[PDB]
Amino acid sequence: ANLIGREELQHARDAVTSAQAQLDVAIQQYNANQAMILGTKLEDQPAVQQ
Amino acid sequence: ANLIGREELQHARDAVTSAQAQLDVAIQQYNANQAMILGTKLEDQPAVQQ
Amino acid sequence: SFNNINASISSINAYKQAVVSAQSSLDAMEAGYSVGTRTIVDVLDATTTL
Amino acid sequence: KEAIYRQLDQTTQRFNVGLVAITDVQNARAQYDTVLANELTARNNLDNAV
């Protein structure tokens, strides 16, 4: 309806995109350190068997 | 009673959720540190016996 | 004289709207104080405006 | 009058979206009524000067 400035909407879209990027970073941080805990059971982990 | 903007209330509830999540983070950190001691006696710790 | 009567009608409408706005502000300020987010100076100022 | 009407339109849209409280709508409505009264007075003064 042409009420608010365009730089305000630009800054809103940029914020949403940045938040998406940060969530991707967090998900990736989780995916790593899940490669170590692949085995379901604690007694079957490679370190314990050694 | 419609005496406050809705965006403010949404922000307040979001703040509560974020605080709860960060408290969970801190609790998990504590648990991770405590898992290596298990509340036994000092003389019986694995390294001391090693 | 005729034009003056018309102007008086319009002014009355404006002042009624102003009164309603002030009442809403006072109610907001009073509720905030009841929940503990505002002082009593704000309540008195709202009363003065009303 | 045109400027204040556009201001009221923006404020009402914003309240509907959920970013401002009802109290701010009342202020815009009051200002709109005040400018309406001022315009009526200006027209009456032009007629009286004629």
Side-chain angles (χ1 to χ4, degrees):
Chain A
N2 183 88
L3 269 47
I4 76 193
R6 298 191 297 271
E7 174 169 45
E8 282 54 63
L9 291 184
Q10 205 73 358
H11 280 44
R13 295 192 311 94
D14 302 3
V16 173
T17 305
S18 57
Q20 186 63 47
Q22 298 289 114
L23 176 53
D24 295 359
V25 175
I27 295 169
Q28 294 305 138
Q29 276 191 272
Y30 173 83
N31 293 349
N33 197 281
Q34 189 61 27
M36 317 298 293
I37 321 170
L38 179 152
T40 58
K41 297 296 183 63
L42 179 58
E43 58 270 8
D44 194 10
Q45 287 291 296
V48 165
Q49 293 176 334
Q50 293 240 32
Chain B
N2 190 13
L3 280 52
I4 190 179
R6 297 193 294 271
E7 191 177 2
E8 196 67 6
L9 285 194
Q10 282 214 23
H11 281 180
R13 185 165 49 84
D14 299 0
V16 179
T17 56
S18 181
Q20 186 58 77
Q22 297 175 80
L23 177 57
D24 301 332
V25 175
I27 292 169
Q28 293 306 146
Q29 283 184 355
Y30 168 77
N31 279 343
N33 177 21
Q34 176 66 350
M36 185 164 285
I37 303 300
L38 298 177
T40 182
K41 277 148 60 179
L42 175 48
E43 312 91 5
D44 295 327
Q45 300 292 348
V48 184
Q49 296 170 306
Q50 189 80 359
Chain C
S1 56
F2 190 79
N3 295 137
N4 291 21
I5 321 309
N6 300 130
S8 184
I9 293 289
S10 288
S11 194
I12 283 171
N13 282 120
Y15 291 180
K16 282 203 300 184
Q17 179 55 218
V19 170
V20 162
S21 178
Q23 183 73 54
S24 178
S25 186
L26 170 61
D27 284 63
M29 296 262 138
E30 202 290 329
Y33 171 76
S34 173
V35 300
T37 58
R38 299 288 173 80
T39 80
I40 206 61
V41 186
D42 304 336
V43 181
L44 299 179
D45 188 68
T47 305
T48 53
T49 290
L50 176 55
Chain D
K1 186 263 286 183
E2 183 64 11
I4 293 167
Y5 176 67
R6 200 161 297 276
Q7 183 60 284
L8 168 58
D9 191 331
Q10 179 183 226
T11 289
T12 304
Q13 287 293 130
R14 188 152 43 247
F15 159 72
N16 207 336
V17 309
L19 291 171
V20 293
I22 186 66
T23 182
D24 89 325
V25 174
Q26 307 298 331
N27 198 22
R29 175 61 64 174
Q31 297 299 337
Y32 182 52
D33 293 357
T34 293
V35 58
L36 185 55
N38 293 342
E39 189 181 350
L40 183 67
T41 306
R43 293 179 177 275
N44 292 20
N45 287 339
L46 179 67
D47 288 0
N48 184 269
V50 166

